[PDB]
Design a protein around this ligand. Structure first.
Ligand code: FES
Length: 97
């Protein structure tokens, strides 16, 4: 099982969840009592944006983030599958601009 540390601080947040390789980060968080932001749940907006600061994901369904944003670690948590243990900063839409 992958271990996913979810951090913000503002928003209050520092909690670790587990996530299977076939489960999206957002869904796993919700199953374990963590309320993360979302709207479309379809990879077509930035509501659920996070930043991957350690580890790897496959978020290839994402259709909203550009190459610079991807290079900076931004992810859409509603369509991200972990491929390793990860540290993800939550509520990162506000950090895009
Ligand atoms: S909630 Fe719209 S991309 Fe995740």
């Amino acid at each position: 099982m992958y271990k996913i540390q979810l951090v913000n601080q503002k928003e209050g947040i520092d909690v670790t969840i587990q996530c299977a390789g076939d489960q999206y980060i957002l869904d796993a968080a919700e199953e374990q009592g963590v309320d993360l932001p979302y709207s479309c749940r379809a990879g077509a907006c930035s509501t659920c944006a996070g930043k991957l600061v350690k580890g790897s994901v496959n978020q290839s369904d994402q259709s909203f983030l550009d190459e610079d944003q991807i290079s900076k670690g931004f992810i859409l948590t509603c369509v991200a599958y972990p491929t390793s243990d990860c540290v993800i900063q939550t509520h990162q839409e506000e950090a895009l601009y």
